[PDB]
RNA sequence: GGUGAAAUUCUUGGAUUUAUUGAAGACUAACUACUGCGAAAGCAUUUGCCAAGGACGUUUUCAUUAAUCAAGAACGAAAGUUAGGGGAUCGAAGAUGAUCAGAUACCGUCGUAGUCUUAACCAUAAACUAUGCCGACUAGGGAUCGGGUGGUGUUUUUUUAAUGACCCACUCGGCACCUUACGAGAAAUCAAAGUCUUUGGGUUCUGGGGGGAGUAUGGUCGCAAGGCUGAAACUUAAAGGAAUUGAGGUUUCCGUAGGUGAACCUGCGGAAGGAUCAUUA
C-alpha cells in the first residue's frame, strides 16, 4: 500500500489526460482521493471501482456537500471479475500486480476507450516503450504496438510517494487503435510466444523444439479435419513432412537467419501470412 | 525357541566399546535378561534369547536397537534412555542428500553444523531434546519423532547456507513454543 | 467377498544335491483351473535364501543364493542355481578407509552353454610391522593383481560346468587360489567372490535335472 | 520343526510406510497395509503410530493366513534420496517384534546407485 | 504423491508395492585422503592401441644454445549461438493449485530450450594461492608421494637364492602441515607478504579517491549474444576503504541466460571475502 503524496505531479497527470467536459471516465484505483475530485470537477460522470469498502465509504463521505456529489459512481469488487460500464477515457493508479493482464483487458473491450493515463513500473514502462532492435523489445512490446499506441509522459521519482518505495514509477499514455487491426488475436499471440520463447535465436532454430512441432501437427490435423482431406503417407508422424513445409516457408520469408528481437512488425506479419497460405495455424 | 541377532561393529568403534563393555553387559542381563557374546573373529556382537529367560521378544528388539544406536557413535546415557523408553528413534541422513556440497564447501557445512566448540549443535541439544552425532559426512539424530523432525528441519535449513543467527532465532522460537505444550 | 487365500494351495520348494540342507521352504500357488495351469506359472520364480540356512553353520551368513524354478511334479517343485550375492552390510563392513579396493569381473561360457559373469573383490592391508597408516598399492600392482584374478577365474570356470563350480564355491577354495597366486605381488587381505549371475542359458535338459535331483 | 517361512518388505518413505508380506519369492503377495489407510488426518500416515498400527494389523493377517516366520528386509525410498530407513520402518520392525512373530535374517535392501542421474532441487537444494 | 497446513495429478480398464525380463540415454557412489597428474581450464569402471610428460639414475652428448617478454599465436569452466544425432534424469521459459495475520515452515505436477555428442563459433568466471616468472641466501619438527643408495634387518617362496611388501638410515624433486620470530607488516598475518630510510639480481603487466561507468563516442573481432580498447561534463568532503578491540524478508557474491509487484525470481557452473564438536590414529 503506497500513497502518492506529491501535490505537483498530480495536476500534470490531470491535464495530460485530455478530458473534455463531456467524457465518461473510468478512474480505476482512486487511492486517497487527491486525483479523483478534479476529474469530478471537469467531467460530467466519473465511475470509480474500489476494492476496500472502508475506503469507498471514506470517498463517498468526502464528496458530501460538494456540487459534484451526484456525478460520482462507486463500484465494488475485484477489477478482473466485474463487468465494466460504458466509459470514454481511463485513468489507472492500481497496484502493479495487475499490470500485465489488464492492459490486454483494455484491448479486448468492445467499443474500446480513446485515451488512458496509466501509472506503471519503470521496467514495465520501458518494456512497453521498446522499439525493435533494442534490448527491451519483447512479446509484450510487439503486442502493445499491435493493439495500441504508447507514449511516455514524465518520470516519477521514488520520494514522491508515502512511503517512498525502492523503485521508480512512470506515467504512460495509451490509445486503442480505431479501428483495430484485422489480424486474428490468438494466432498472433501463439506466433509471438513461439518466436519469443528465446529472444536471441533465429526463427528457424526456434521451430526445432518438440512441443511446437507437436502443436503444429495437432493444428494441421484439425485443419484437415474441418477441411475434410485425407492425410497422405509419412515416414513417422506426418509433421516431419510438415518440417520441409516449414523449411520451404523459410525460403521466401528469408527469416531463417534473422532473429525475433531484431525484426520489425512487417516481417512478423509477412511470416504469419506465410503460414496462412500454406495452411499452418496456431489456434 | 532361541533367537539370534548379529550386529556388526566398525573397527574404529571397537576400542570405545571395550572401555564401555563392563558398563553394558551387566544391565543387559539384570534388567533385560538377554545373553550377549562378543565375537572378535567376525568383529560382531551376538544377541540371543532363550525361553528360559524373560518371555519378551521386544526385549531382544530393544537390545538390538540399543547396540545399533551405540555402534553408530552415540553416548552411553542416550542409549540407556533408548532402552528405558519406547519412543526414541534415529534419523540418519547425509549432507549431499540435501544439497550437493563438494570440497571445502562440505567441510564448511560440517563446521557450520558443529560451530565453535560444538555449541551451536549443543544449542539444538538444548532446544529439541534430541541427540545429534556427526559422522565424517553422515549425521544421526536420536529422540522423539516430532523432536527428530524439528531437529532435522533445523539442521537441514542450516546446511543450505543459512547463518547461525537465523537458526538461533528459530531455536529460541521453537523452545518457547515447545515448552508450553 | 472372494477370499482367494482359502482358494490357494501350498507347495514345497527344495534345493539341489550340492547343498546339505536341500529343503528350502514353502510357497503358495492358486488352483490350476481352466485356461490357466499351475506348472507354467512356476517356471519364472527366483527364490533367495541365505547360505547359512542351506549349510547349517553361521560362517556363510553373508552370502545369499538366488535359485530359479525348473520342474514341478507331485506337490514337489525342483529348482536350479541362478546366482550368488553378498549381503550389503558385509560390503559396508569390508570397505573401510586407508586401503585400496580392487575389483574384477570376467564373463565366461562354461563347458555347457551357461554364459556367466563373475565378480571378485580384494583389499589391501599392513603386514603387522608397519608404522605407515594407509598402505595403498601402486597402479601397476593393481593391474597385475586384476590380471591374475581374471585369469584364475576364467581358468576355474571355463573348464567345468556349474555343478562342480558351485561345489567349489561352497568351500571358497577360489579365495585360497587367488591368495596363493598373488602372495608375491602384494599381501592382499580379504578376498571374496562377491557376485555371480546367469547371463545365457541352454535348453531345459530335464535329464541333467533328474541327475542332480532325485533325493529324499 | 514345522515352520512356514515368508518374507516382509518394509518400504519407509518420507510420507508413508508400506509393509508387504509375501512367500519366499516375491510372487503371490499376502497382505499390504499402509499408514494412509489406518489414520485419517493427512499428516500422521508417516507417524510411527500409524506404522505400528499397520504392522499389528498385517501381523494379525499373517498369523491368520498361516505363515509364522518372516525374513524381513527394510528399505527407504532409495535412489538419489536418503537411502536409509526412517523412524516408520524402525517402528514397524519393533511392532512386528511385539507381535511375537518369528524374525530372522535382518538385512536392508535400499537401492544404492553408482553415481546415477541428478536429484531434485537444482543446485540450491530443497528449501526444507 | 506432496508440503507448515492443502490442492492439481494417477487410481476397482488395478494407482502405489511385490516378482521376472527388456530398452533408452546419462553418471562413475563406497574405496576418496589437508593423496596424485596437467600450462591453466580440468581429470576417477575394465582392457587394448597411439603419441606425450615430470622426477630419479648416468665417469652419455653438444658448449651458452639462456631468463622475461610489445607484435603475433595455441588452449581456455559453465552459460550462449548455426546445423546433424538420439533425447533417460534434471530442468531457465511456459501451462496450471491455493494464497491460510505467519510463510517464520514462499511450495506442487507436467514440461520447451538446455543438459550428452559431431562439425563450426564465442572467449568470459570469486578463471582465487584474491600472492607474475626466473636465480640465490636465511629456522626447528613430524608425516606423505615418485626415483635412487646402504642394512651377514623382517616376511611370503618351499628352501629361505632375485623380486614383491614392511622396517631403519640418507638423498633428489613435489603436495601440503605444526611451532617460533633472525626479520616484515597498519593489522589480520607471512619461511615469504623476509634478506629496505642502513633503501639496486634480471624482466613483463598493472594502479595513482568514490559515484558518473566499464557508461558515451570512435576503432577492431564476433552470425548474434557480446568481447578488447576506453572518456568527459556534473557531484561528495561528518566522501571511499583495510584490520582489530572497546509491516515483511534476512547467507554474501561472480561469469552467463531467461522472466517481471515492491529493482526481484529461477536454470548451469564457480568462490568463502562463512563458526570442526564427539571417537580413533
UniProtKB/Swiss-Prot annotation, chain A:
Organism of derivation: Saccharomyces cerevisiae (strain ATCC 204508 / S288c)
Superkingdom classification of source: Eukaryota
Enzyme class (EC, first level): transferase
Keyword terms: Cytoplasm, Methyltransferase, Nucleus, Ribosome biogenesis, RNA-binding, rRNA processing, S-adenosyl-L-methionine, Transferase
Gene3D superfamilies on file: 1.10.8.480, Vaccinia Virus protein VP39
InterPro entries: KsgA/Erm, rRNA_Ade_Mease_Trfase_CS, rRNA_Ade_methylase_Trfase_N, rRNA_adenine_dimethylase, SAM-dependent_MTases_sf
GO CC terms, sorted: 90S preribosome; cytoplasm; nucleolus; preribosome, small subunit precursor
Main subcellular localisation: cytoplasm
One biological process term in Gene Ontology: maturation of SSU-rRNA from tricistronic rRNA transcript (SSU-rRNA, 5.8S rRNA, LSU-rRNA)
Protein name: Dimethyladenosine transferase
Cross-referenced SMART domains: rADc (SM00650)
Family: Belongs to the class I-like SAM-binding methyltransferase superfamily. rRNA adenine N(6)-methyltransferase family.
PROSITE patterns, A to Z: RRNA_A_DIMETH, SAM_RNA_A_N6_MT
Gene of this entry: DIM1
Cellular compartment(s): Cytoplasm; Nucleus, Nucleolus
Role noted for this protein: Specifically dimethylates two adjacent adenosines in the loop of a conserved hairpin near the 3'-end of 18S rRNA in the 40S particle.
Keyword Membrane part of the UniProt annotation: no
UniProtKB/Swiss-Prot annotation, chain B:
Complete-protein stretch covered: 93 to 273 of 274
Family in the record: Belongs to the PNO1 family.
Subunit structure: Component of the small ribosomal subunit, ribosomal RNA processing complex (SSU RRP complex). Interacts with NOB1.
Domain KH: 103-155
Keyword Phosphoprotein in record: yes
Subcellular location: Cytoplasm; Nucleus, Nucleolus
UniProt-recorded name of the protein: Pre-rRNA-processing protein PNO1
Effect of residue 111 to D: Temperature-sensitive
One annotated GO biological process: endonucleolytic cleavage in ITS1 to separate SSU-rRNA from 5.8S rRNA and LSU-rRNA from tricistronic rRNA transcript (SSU-rRNA, 5.8S rRNA, LSU-rRNA)
From Swiss-Prot, chain C:
Transferase found in the keyword field: no
Modification(s) after translation: N-terminally acetylated by acetyltransferase NatA.
Location in or out of the cell: Cytoplasm
Tagged with keyword Hydrolase: no
Principal localisation: cytoplasm
UniProt KW keywords: Acetylation, Cytoplasm, Isopeptide bond, Phosphoprotein, Ribonucleoprotein, Ribosomal protein, Ubl conjugation
Signal sequence segment: none
Alphabetized GO MF terms: structural constituent of ribosome
One BP term from GO: cytoplasmic translation
A Gene Ontology cellular-component term: 90S preribosome
Further details from the record: Present with 92400 molecules/cell in log phase SD medium.
Protein family (similarity comment): Belongs to the eukaryotic ribosomal protein eS1 family.
Function comment: Component of the ribosome, a large ribonucleoprotein complex responsible for the synthesis of proteins in the cell. The small ribosomal subunit (SSU) binds messenger RNAs (mRNAs) and translates the encoded message by selecting cognate aminoacyl-transfer RNA (tRNA) molecules. The large subunit (LSU) contains the ribosomal catalytic site termed the peptidyl transferase center (PTC), which catalyzes the formation of peptide bonds, thereby polymerizing the amino acids delivered by tRNAs into a polypeptide chain.
Descriptive protein name: Small ribosomal subunit protein eS1A
Full-length numbering of the shown residues: 20 to 235 of 255
From Swiss-Prot, chain D:
Gene Ontology MF annotations: mRNA binding; structural constituent of ribosome
Localization per record: Cytoplasm; Nucleus, Nucleolus
Annotated InterPro entries: Ribosomal_uS11 (IPR001971), Ribosomal_uS11_CS (IPR018102), Ribosomal_uS11_sf (IPR036967)
Keyword Chloroplast: no
Main localization of the protein described in the UniProt heading: cytoplasm
GO cellular component terms given for this protein: 90S preribosome; cytosol; cytosolic small ribosomal subunit; nucleolus; nucleoplasm; small-subunit processome
Protein family membership: Belongs to the universal ribosomal protein uS11 family.
Function: Component of the ribosome, a large ribonucleoprotein complex responsible for the synthesis of proteins in the cell. The small ribosomal subunit (SSU) binds messenger RNAs (mRNAs) and translates the encoded message by selecting cognate aminoacyl-transfer RNA (tRNA) molecules. The large subunit (LSU) contains the ribosomal catalytic site termed the peptidyl transferase center (PTC), which catalyzes the formation of peptide bonds, thereby polymerizing the amino acids delivered by tRNAs into a polypeptide chain.
Protein name: Small ribosomal subunit protein uS11A
Species for this entry: Saccharomyces cerevisiae (strain ATCC 204508 / S288c) (Baker's yeast)
Lineage: Eukaryota, Fungi, Dikarya, Ascomycota, Saccharomycotina
